[PDB]
Symmetry: D3
Amino acid sequence: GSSGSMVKPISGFLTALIQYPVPVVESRADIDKQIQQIIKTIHSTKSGYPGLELIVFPEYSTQGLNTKKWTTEEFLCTVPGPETDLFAEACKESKVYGVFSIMEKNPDGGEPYNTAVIIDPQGEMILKYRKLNPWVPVEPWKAGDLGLPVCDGPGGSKLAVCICHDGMFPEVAREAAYKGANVLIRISGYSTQVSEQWMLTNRSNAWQNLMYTLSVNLAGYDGVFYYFGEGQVCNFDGTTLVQGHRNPWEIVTAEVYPELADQARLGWGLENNIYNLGSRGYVATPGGVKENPYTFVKDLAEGKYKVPWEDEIKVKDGSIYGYPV
Amino acid sequence: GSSGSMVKPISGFLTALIQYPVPVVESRADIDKQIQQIIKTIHSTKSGYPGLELIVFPEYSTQGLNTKKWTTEEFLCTVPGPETDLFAEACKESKVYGVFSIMEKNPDGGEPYNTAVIIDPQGEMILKYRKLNPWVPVEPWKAGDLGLPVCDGPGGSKLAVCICHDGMFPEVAREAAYKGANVLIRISGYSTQVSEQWMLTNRSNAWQNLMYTLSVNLAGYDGVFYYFGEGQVCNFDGTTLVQGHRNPWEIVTAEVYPELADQARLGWGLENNIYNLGSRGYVATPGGVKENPYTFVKDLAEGKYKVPWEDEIKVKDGSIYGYPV
Amino acid sequence: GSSGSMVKPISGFLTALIQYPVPVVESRADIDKQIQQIIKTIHSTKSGYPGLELIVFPEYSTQGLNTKKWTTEEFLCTVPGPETDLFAEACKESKVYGVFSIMEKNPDGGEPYNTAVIIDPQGEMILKYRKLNPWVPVEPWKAGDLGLPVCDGPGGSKLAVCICHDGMFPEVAREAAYKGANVLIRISGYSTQVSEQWMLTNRSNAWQNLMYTLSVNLAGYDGVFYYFGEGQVCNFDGTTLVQGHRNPWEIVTAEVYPELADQARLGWGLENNIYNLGSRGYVATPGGVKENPYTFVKDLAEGKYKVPWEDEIKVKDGSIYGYPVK
Amino acid sequence: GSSGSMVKPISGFLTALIQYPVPVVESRADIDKQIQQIIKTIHSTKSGYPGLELIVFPEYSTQGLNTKKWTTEEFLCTVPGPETDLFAEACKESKVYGVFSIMEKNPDGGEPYNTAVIIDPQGEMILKYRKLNPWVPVEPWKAGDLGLPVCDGPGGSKLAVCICHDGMFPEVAREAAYKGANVLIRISGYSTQVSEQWMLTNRSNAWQNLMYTLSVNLAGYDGVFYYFGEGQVCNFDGTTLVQGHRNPWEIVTAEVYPELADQARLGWGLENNIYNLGSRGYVATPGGVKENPYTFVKDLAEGKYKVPWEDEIKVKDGSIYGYPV
Amino acid sequence: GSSGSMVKPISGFLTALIQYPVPVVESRADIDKQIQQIIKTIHSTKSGYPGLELIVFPEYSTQGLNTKKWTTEEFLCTVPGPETDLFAEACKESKVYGVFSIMEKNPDGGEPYNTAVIIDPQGEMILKYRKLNPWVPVEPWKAGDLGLPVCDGPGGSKLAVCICHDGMFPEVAREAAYKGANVLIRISGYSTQVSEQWMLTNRSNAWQNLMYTLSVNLAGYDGVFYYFGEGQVCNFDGTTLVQGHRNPWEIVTAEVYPELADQARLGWGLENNIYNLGSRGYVATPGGVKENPYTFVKDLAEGKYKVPWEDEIKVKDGSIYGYPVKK
Amino acid sequence: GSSGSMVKPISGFLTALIQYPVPVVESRADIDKQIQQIIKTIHSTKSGYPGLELIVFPEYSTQGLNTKKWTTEEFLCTVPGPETDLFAEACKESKVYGVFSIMEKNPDGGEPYNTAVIIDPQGEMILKYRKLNPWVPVEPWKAGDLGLPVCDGPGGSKLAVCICHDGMFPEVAREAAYKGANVLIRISGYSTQVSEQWMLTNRSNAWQNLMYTLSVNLAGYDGVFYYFGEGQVCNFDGTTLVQGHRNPWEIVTAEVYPELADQARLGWGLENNIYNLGSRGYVATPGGVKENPYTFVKDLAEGKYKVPWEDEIKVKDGSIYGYPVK
Ligand code: NA
Ligand code: NA
Ligand code: NA
Ligand code: NA
Ligand code: NA
Ligand code: NA
Ligand code: NA
Ligand code: NA
Ligand code: NA
Ligand code: NA
Ligand code: NA
Ligand code: NA
Ligand code: NA
Ligand code: NA
Ligand code: NA
């Protein structure tokens, strides 16, 4: 990749990551005002960067983090719904791919999901993802049930999205890559608690999988936490190409060349780790050793991952934040 | 942890990571010479740091990387054998735990293993590990078949060792932690190709698992590659506490406090990721959702991990380095 | 220490350092407004971080830096007084230790002090400190007369506070440690002039004394200076564990483990400097050489510290900032 | 200051800091060898940098750290003596100021001193300093008894020297400045244990006192420790101007402008800390408050500095390193 | 230099670089507001830093970047004019040198210029510079026609100013030095696209010419771009002495010692590059070889600089930003 | 680019920059030893990195910096000559492009040149460059007279080479780019005096020209100077991709993708500076303003570049290093 210009590059695409100000949301009218602001930002960012093809908004940019109201019906939406339809129309008008965050009413009447979507330049929803790893114990969201999907994006990209806490699990980035993604998008609403670990994992998620990472967090203060922004683009070898600071409204742009990541995946010998993981020691054993050597992988596959100190873990429900058990 | 002093700390232990000069080895006599030099280093390092409890030598410190001879009978050892017995006697005399690298004859006559051992202050071998992920296509070693073991170490530690390339797989660090390790040791013989990614993964391996990492590579030139050294100690939150440069014989020391990592594992709410991985969204679903959402985990567990571009991967054997297919 | 979570750690405590926006204060009503905002921040920060035990506000967070009014009666408070009582009630309700800044009317009628207090989770004032080293020539405050006190804090801590400019004097950090502190708190209202030296001294103050440092400055623009924020937590070996940027309202949190600093003080050989300072060369001389080798220490002790170029120093009063020379 | 050229600057002087290889010294003949090497280095460095006025060698550059022989008569010298005479002749011939390290026989037959000298371009010894703060418990040296002297140096400098561990005490840098020094020279023989804290204190020692710092350590391995080098020049505001790495024989040069430090001392208002220390709150109290507010200063002045936990300190003699009672 | 205090240093001067908030400007009334705010900032900054002698405002601090109105008559000014007269009165009252940005009506009726001025402590305009390298294709400004002037400044300085994109051309910094400048001031209204390259070029512009650099950008969001601030002072050897972050209203101050740069220029042997450029290999050839070895220098001098891939360059007019393509 | 693997990438090429130990050279026999060692390094490096296409050796790697002997006939070579023939045979055998440094006898008997060559995988010399900017006053070399040439390299590259001090002149990097280079190679024998400025200029040379930079210096001590190594690969936007430290024999490798730099040159709008330099303000003036605004460019083009303080410059000959003046 590169820090880029304002044009569609010959190889690849231009992205803008928006360090969107954290919303303070008290009612549905406030959600409508965030929707209008997000839409305004799509058009304005396209006017400033005419070659733009992928614009990325953070987790909670639509609805905020009003922890006293965020699972009320007033604060939830269907996906797709009227709100994603408005985002879609704006993506169609500006001819961009957009990434949006919606807290989603559960269609079966159970606990709501934390959802991300990608909409293409024709206004079609091409990816819907439900956050696999809610940020417990503060978050009430149901664990996502759609796996980690991938879609075709601009400039030969294969895109996956993950949300905030998801990106701390190397299993999320590995899965994205395994499903074919050469660009992992991470949209986020973290407080300052993990500012260093955000940058660190954006780099490791990239390197381990020969995959670009594009990552952005909300920025500013909502009366409880400060959200750090730190929009970040990492090359497929883990090198940071562009890094935002902690200001509301910082825009982080870069040229990304997906073909280079694909080529490394096809071409690399030493450090072709995405391939090596499941085909070990291929010089000694033609084709590589396929059997799994990791007990955690077996246990997790079987739905019985259990750390040996689990009985002594103190925080296992939401009571510390006042959620009923 | 801390950059420390030369004493046994009240809560933990003192470690010395040796950026051992890369050996140039032409015969078994040269291996004997390296053995003697390693042993000399155990005693000298203990004399300089009287509180020392864990001394760590890099991969290939015993035998070098003579790629024309490294799988000949002359260049291989049994584990345990006379060579590990000499290391053991030195650990007993200096009253330290030691970590050593031996290229190991395969007891069935097949391809040899790349092995690491931990020996305790009584001279007992308490851990034997065979490199799970050889550095293909340059390395001829058989994929390890002993899993990733853990043992009791000094200062309340639970130690695991991995070797070089292994530490680029987040699955290795995750497995170590899952088996109970609160300190992952990475012994390494990498060339300069991965200097940045070495530091990056030592940090991410620590953070993702609330685990200390202690990591050291050979240093210097062997006539083919330059080996970067870069001994590194990372806190359980991923923060680098001490970092060596690229000189032969640099010694990197630090105080490590294993109980702090155990306590974070028992105590942390937000970012208790080692627990969260297999018990998702516990606020919405009491006890957490246990079902595996990752296709790669299923496929790997089933011995059928296969990336979707596998047929187009160019490097699948050792022919580029002159190994017969 | 560590960058931490939102829980009370098993060995220590969780702290939040608030890069409070610099207040623009024109009247007593504005001071009341800041008090309300500080109190609101205590409750809101505790709700976000349930394990929180120590919340730290910067210098001038209560009253601002209105240099045309800051020594008028309207802009000063008694310590304790109604304002610290309101802070105390908030610390009691949220069950936290709090650190606050109050410009203090001098009880004898002389020049006012720049004061910091620590209030415990029962709402008791457990520490009162008057700034030893006013930021001259801009600051009008009387040099502090209470020494550098220490108190018991959360998680086995022994806390000391210093204010802004104080932390540029290694003598301040040394004194805190010598009085028993294993955590030095620095509350500050600096402009951008010293941004780099802020971070540097927070590290050196820690390392030299085998002591944690927790330090935070106001952030934002007041119409004259930009205040840099840069909340910072340093390990007892000087390593920065967490670092804020320059934004108003950034919260910097960390886990601190005071017992690790105490243990290093008891255990370290090489680099046990807090002990070595006054007991030199103990291998050659059993018990160490005790006699003072520093002329500045003697002179300062005797109230006659005088640099050899003192007669040629140009700035010796507040006239450059329009203070009358008295 | 500046990273400079190879000329005598119009306002100041050029310095070369030598990351001299740590000597391995087994006899007096080896000490003679180091003397010859040091002298060779004076001449060669002057030939390379014709404007050079101050060359600085590290602690133990003459005699090494043979901890089994370093207090024997064979390994000690008188100061002045034949060895400093040879250094002096070399300074005279090359027309430079030089800074040298000698372990010094105690003229009364008691424990030896660790000594530094400055010799001028006429071959006169203009400064003799005995290490105030031996690095206990490893070092056997008697605590210095000459205070912290200052002398006139090149380019309007007032020079002080301190040794290794001394520079960890802010009281040493403060004393140098109080005696009139505008350049503090730190010659050192530290192991890698304090690499970070070396750079940190070289910066703080400068900033706190509006003083340049010029600091250099031995580099390389002596069979026990690795010595980090890291020659460092800091501006009077604490900014690092030039920084060496950890290699034997690295030369760190810089232009230093002493009059700029003197001018800041005369001119600065805010942050004139060297003046402010003993004259507090001068706006409220004309002339400043002079009384000492620091108990440690009183106690130290009275020869009774005693930390409140002193009875529980574990390391109070050299027994951990095998020094008798 | 040094991070400094708030006094006039004995050898040099104190500067304040203002990371002025990017204005959102809809009308002339908004331009008048910015003028008042700039003036307020001059007085307030002087009150905070009594030794201050040079205050620097960014490009577009007066008029913003309203790309739909920025070349209308309502949004342009004459230089000098009533607006620079108000800046001048404020410099006189506070006794400082000031650096200001004005989008300038072209006196011949052609396309407007992007202009910077320096005003001295007596309120006299001592430098006027028209941006040589407009930020194309977004900017409509006429390429500057006044060269790169220099003037006398405080503390023995010889000042030059350049504007934003200008500082990406090493030819600009070289020219400033060649004309005698020992301090190059760069005033800027860049978006985040070049945040790293800003810091990099401020250092290289300094080192290559044995020249101090003082550089500052607008900060904040205007509804289209985020402007990064990053006020920066570099020593004459390229070392960064002080660095601002990306916040609106950050003030970056430093002591600068111009005489140290002059002395290096007179004194340095190895790396006296500003001299070496045009007198090569003087040990082998007494006086140095003077002939041009660079084809680009010849071509540029002759007004025929043409890169060998020029015919394939895609962006050669303003159409991608909706500017009509003329002639 | 990328930190890469050991393979020929699908879009570009793999390079190895050798931080070759500084030679201490006392005679022609020592030069022959360096030639053998360089050749050995070509073969060994190819064995370690089978996809390698470009290997780069530093300035003075063949002959050292024996300043008392370096212009004697014994220490000089012809270019081409037997020595470059041996390098060429090694490049042919290993199938790599190689970059070498030779101090070159002047064919007219005058002062010698400091020369760099590029040899291709068929053993053909495809580029010869004489150092334009000798490192005065220490260097005795004649100012180069061949301009700054360019050649075709591996992976669609257009290569230029410059030598040490040359890379401190932005005019050198600009010229390389103007002649078509998308990869500038800088081979160097600097002392530690310019360590920081080396890294800085390698980045600015890249960014200003939308050009990759590949740069490497000798490393180690020769009895006079320490040579810093610091092999460095910069992306065409100025971002450092790989950075060596100061050790002898460090090998710095990277994948470089020349077509990405060409594409940015064709495609970029904002910051297409290599184009913008000579066609200014093209929105206001169709085609851009072509007239030169820089007096230094006019003066230099006219062979009359003269700084206004030139009469007061103190160092104008080699006398400070003992070179006779005339
Ligand atoms: Na638009
Ligand atoms: Na950007
Ligand atoms: Na269990
Ligand atoms: Na593998
Ligand atoms: Na297995
Ligand atoms: Na423990
Ligand atoms: Na994993
Ligand atoms: Na330099
Ligand atoms: Na200090
Ligand atoms: Na790599
Ligand atoms: Na000869
Ligand atoms: Na020739
Ligand atoms: Na490399
Ligand atoms: Na010409
Ligand atoms: Na000519």
